[PDB]
């Protein structure tokens, strides 16, 4: 139901596809529109390897979501299994150049379209690698978000698919 509960839309694909793709070392990416949980969805196909890299990216219309508690998507593994991800979010630079801090998940879907509400208290840093104009607040700042990033935690050739990408408020 609209305008009655504490959720706000990030992307439900009813426009033009703004998302990134890239690869190397024998892996591949293909992003395309499909049918989803309301109107259209998005599917993403891959080849995967072990020592390579394969990726898809989004830049947000809002990055100032301190009052919100969770992300949500309705998502499945359409590779032939149920495969996991180590996916990433960037904080804004305190020098106004590059990025400010890097923060990540470890999570898995299944083979069917479940809603996956994940809170801000899920995360840890990207621990090899951080910016020169950095934040050191000891935490992720939802006040201060720049961009979001796919990262590999499986080596499959296969697919994944979504609709309904949102922010969710508290449960009080």
Least distance to Ca ion, CB of residue 11, Å? 9
Distances (CA, A) of 131 to 3, 37, 157: 39, 38, 32
Least distance to Ca ion, CB of residue 154, Å? 26
- The window from 3-11, 36-44, 121-129, 146-154 that contacts Ca ion (CB under 5 A) reads 36-44
Q: Cα separation of 167 and 73, whole Å?
A: 9
> Binding to Ca ion by residue 39, rule CB under 5 A?
yes
For residues 129 to 158, the per-residue mask of contacts with Ca ion, x marking binding by CB under 5 A and - elsewhere, is ------x-x---x-----------------
> Of these, 78, 104, 163, 167, which contacts Ca ion (CB under 5 A)?
163
Distances (CA, A) of 20 to 9, 23, 44, 95, 103: 19, 11, 11, 26, 19
> Binding to Ca ion by residue 36, rule CB under 5 A?
yes
Per-residue burial over 143-154, b = 16 or more CB atoms within 10 Å of its CB, e = otherwise: ebbbbbbbebeb
For residues 58 to 97, the per-residue mask of contacts with Ca ion, x marking binding by CB under 5 A and - elsewhere, is ----------------------------------------
> Binding to Ca ion by residue 11, rule CB under 5 A?
no
> Binding to Ca ion by residue 115, rule CB under 5 A?
no
Distances (CA, A) of 108 to 17, 76, 127, 137, 168: 24, 9, 21, 28, 19
Q: What is the size of the binding site for Ca ion (CB under 5 A)?
A: 10
Least distance to Ca ion, CB of residue 50, Å? 32
**Token pair 């590779």 in the structure block, residue:** 79
The smaller minimum CB distance to Ca ion, of residues 16 and 171, is found at 16
Per-residue burial over 50-60, b = 16 or more CB atoms within 10 Å of its CB, e = otherwise: eeeebbbeeee
Task: Name the site residues for Ca ion (rule: CB under 5 A).
Answer: 12-13, 36, 38-39, 101, 135, 137, 141, 163
């Amino acid at each position: 139901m609209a305008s009655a509960v504490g959720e706000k839309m990030l992307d439900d694909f009813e426009g033009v596809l703004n998302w990134g793709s890239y690869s190397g070392e024998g892996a591949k990416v293909s992003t395309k529109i499909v049918s989803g949980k309301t109107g259209n969805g998005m599917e993403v196909s891959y080849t995967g390897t072990t020592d390579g890299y394969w990726g898809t990216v989004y830049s947000l219309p809002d990055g100032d979501w301190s009052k919100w508690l969770k992300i949500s998507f309705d998502i499945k593994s359409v590779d032939g299994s149920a495969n996991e991800i180590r996916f990433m979010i960037a904080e804004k630079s305190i020098n106004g150049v590059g990025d400010g801090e890097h923060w990540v998940y470890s999570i898995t879907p299944d083979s069917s379209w479940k809603t996956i509400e994940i809170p801000f208290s899920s995360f840890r840093r990207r621990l090899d690698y951080q910016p020169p104009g950095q934040d050191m607040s000891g935490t992720l700042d939802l006040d201060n978000i720049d961009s979001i990033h796919f990262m590999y935690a499986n080596n499959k050739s296969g697919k994944f698919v979504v609709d309904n990408i949102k922010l969710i408020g508290a449960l009080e």
